[PDB]
Design a protein around this nucleic acid. Sequence first.
RNA 1: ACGGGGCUAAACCAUGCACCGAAGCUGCGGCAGCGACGCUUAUGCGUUGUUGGGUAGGGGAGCGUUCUGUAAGCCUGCGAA
RNA 2: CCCCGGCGAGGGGAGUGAAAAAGAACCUGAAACCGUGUACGUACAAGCAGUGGGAGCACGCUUAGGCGUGUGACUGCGUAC
Lengths: 103, 117, 110, 34, 142, 48
Amino acid sequence: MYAVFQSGGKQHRVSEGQTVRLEKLDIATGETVEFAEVLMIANGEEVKIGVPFVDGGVIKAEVVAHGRGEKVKIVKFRRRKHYRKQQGHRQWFTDVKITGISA
Amino acid sequence: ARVKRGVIARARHKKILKQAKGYYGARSRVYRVAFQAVIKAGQYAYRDRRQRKRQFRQLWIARINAAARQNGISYSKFINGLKKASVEIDRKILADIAVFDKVAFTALVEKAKAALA
Amino acid sequence: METIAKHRHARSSAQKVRLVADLIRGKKVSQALDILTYTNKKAAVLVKKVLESAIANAEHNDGADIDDLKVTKIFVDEGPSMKRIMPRAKGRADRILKRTSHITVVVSDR
Amino acid sequence: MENNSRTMPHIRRTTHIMKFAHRNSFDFHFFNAR
Amino acid sequence: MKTFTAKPETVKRDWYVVDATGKTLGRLATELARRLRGKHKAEYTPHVDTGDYIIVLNADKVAVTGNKRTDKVYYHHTGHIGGIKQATFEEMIARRPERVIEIAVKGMLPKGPLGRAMFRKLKVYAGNEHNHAAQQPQVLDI
Amino acid sequence: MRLNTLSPAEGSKKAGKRLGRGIGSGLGKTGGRGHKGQKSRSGGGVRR
RNA sequence: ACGGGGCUAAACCAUGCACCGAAGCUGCGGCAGCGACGCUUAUGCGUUGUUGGGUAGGGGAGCGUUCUGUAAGCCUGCGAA
RNA sequence: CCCCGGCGAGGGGAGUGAAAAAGAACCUGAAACCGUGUACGUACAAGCAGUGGGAGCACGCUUAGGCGUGUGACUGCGUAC
Ligand SMILES: NCCC[C@H](N)C(=O)O
Ligand SMILES: [K+]
Ligand SMILES: [K+]
Ligand SMILES: [K+]
Ligand SMILES: [K+]
Ligand SMILES: [Mg+2]
Ligand SMILES: [Mg+2]
Ligand SMILES: [Mg+2]
Ligand SMILES: [Mg+2]
Ligand SMILES: [Mg+2]
Ligand SMILES: [Mg+2]
Ligand SMILES: [Mg+2]
Ligand SMILES: [Mg+2]
Ligand SMILES: [Mg+2]
Ligand SMILES: [Mg+2]
Ligand SMILES: [Mg+2]
Ligand SMILES: [Mg+2]
Ligand SMILES: [Mg+2]
Ligand SMILES: [Mg+2]
Ligand SMILES: [Mg+2]
Ligand SMILES: [Mg+2]
Ligand SMILES: [Mg+2]
Ligand SMILES: [Mg+2]
Ligand SMILES: [Mg+2]
Ligand SMILES: [Mg+2]
Ligand SMILES: [Mg+2]
Ligand SMILES: [Mg+2]
Ligand SMILES: [Mg+2]
Ligand SMILES: [Mg+2]
Ligand SMILES: [Mg+2]
């Protein structure tokens, strides 16, 4: 049994027990999140296709961690024109653990 | 106040040659060649963070097109039928259901065929 | 037990000795002495005296037996070069390198 | 003149070696872009 | 989640047989190039050969339109100077008819080591007979 | 009030221009002089 | 003398509806500049608008190296450079 | 002092010393450059040698899985300063 929900401008296909990495949420670590905009729920050839939302469908998850991602190095270079500049970047995430797909 | 450059210049050269590991020949040994290769590897990486988003949507669309033609519809009519049926599933998830759950993909095609008819 | 003998500052280039040292790598020392006897190289005279001295080191300083020994490692390293001056035509002067080598022979029964 | 050469102390005037117009086998038909 | 990638050790390839009698050359060749590449499968990966094996029968009875039976010219060079050689469509059919379909499909495949491995699954025969009955090819009415 | 607690007033110790010390400084490779001619030369420039 | 294969349309003309397509626009997260208004500042925070390709060149803010004071202090043979 | 060797060069023990990889070619002992060993890749394959994707193998972990390190078949893009 999986479900499709949108979070952080992107969509995810998740199941119960799975740990999902999202964008940063302003929720404390250990607090429960609910996703009421569920897009599709499928449980053994019974498919609820949301139009756009399966109404009555909520995904519950537990925030387990915040943190920054692996550092990406940004390099800009223009040859023969005496220009280069460099920049680093680390991206914030939020790890949630899916606890219930209730259709 | 005389400043010798030995310790600072050695640490700067060692930092570049650590980033040039795995490169062929003088590109992993020689500083003049390695520095030049680390800059080009950073320009390619900046360019291919934009190209990675283009190549995956190209791969999702080609997989959606193949699984939709197994159900009697092309890509361009399957996308139009899902927009008419108010389905907001993106191409990443559609191409993932097309591989792993084939009868749930059949349910989406029949939804799109109903909205066109 | 591993046993080393070395010839440092041997008067020849490392590329010429390495041709002879690849003949006896991994061999039993009785087989390796026969290969060096019928090799028509100047470097085969050099490598044989280091292999003979490693066999004598292992039975005198380590109490090993000669029938058990094998050449487990052998390698040639480059030594210091001597700088000479060679006159050429029209006042040109070239530099001659006289290359030396460090020969290392390693024997062990294990 | 090259008076304190350390690589070639025996010679002071060496332009008969590498300059093409000062070699003994220079011919003036090489200079035909006139 | 990372996108699925087909793994070349657990890919399933199947065997098909196609009759080229009366087919248009290029319109038959475009469909052969899809299935040797694996464009018709949802497990399609651009760096993995996920395509099928296809037997083509009756290559000497393929059809072209217009005046192309006398006007389509195949060129090659031998590597020796002055060595440009040509052959019309009628001469390629009479001398070596399997090359006509093999040349047409080879131009529609990708160029590189993977496209050369996609070409190896095409089996073209000039007649009505093949000897691949042990592989049990399915009739593909295309 | 110690010898390692005294400070200058803010704005009184502007640092000087150092020409020709890399790309990031904004003054490398020409020292603010532009490309060729009399004014880019050492000791160059016309009189009063 | 179509980029190639090939094409009698997979060419050309007219009409129509889909879709692909960029670092453009939108979504989500983050940083900075300049304005405006404020939980009130003591010069920093909050809300909001907008901006952030760049050579020559102008302006602003920093890192690190050797030496002097703080230092007859502090670390260090239980291991300094 | 003993052993191999030409009553050599050079080395292996022994001994001195806190240390001899402090042995007189002697404090520390970087880099270019040259080797030995091990893991993976490489003999149908075309180009600034990387970058994005990515199978397999080897070694570590730790598990009711899939992470770390090394290598990189195949593939999109890509003509140094
Ligand atoms: N007067 C003669 C001097 C010769 C000198 N060695 C030279 O090369 O000029
Ligand atoms: K100026
Ligand atoms: K020492
Ligand atoms: K070294
Ligand atoms: K590549
Ligand atoms: Mg001569
Ligand atoms: Mg003379
Ligand atoms: Mg003289
Ligand atoms: Mg200056
Ligand atoms: Mg500037
Ligand atoms: Mg000027
Ligand atoms: Mg200039
Ligand atoms: Mg000018
Ligand atoms: Mg002057
Ligand atoms: Mg002047
Ligand atoms: Mg074209
Ligand atoms: Mg669209
Ligand atoms: Mg885009
Ligand atoms: Mg864009
Ligand atoms: Mg934009
Ligand atoms: Mg700017
Ligand atoms: Mg001081
Ligand atoms: Mg220091
Ligand atoms: Mg001690
Ligand atoms: Mg001792
Ligand atoms: Mg000392
Ligand atoms: Mg030393
Ligand atoms: Mg060393
Ligand atoms: Mg091969
Ligand atoms: Mg071939």
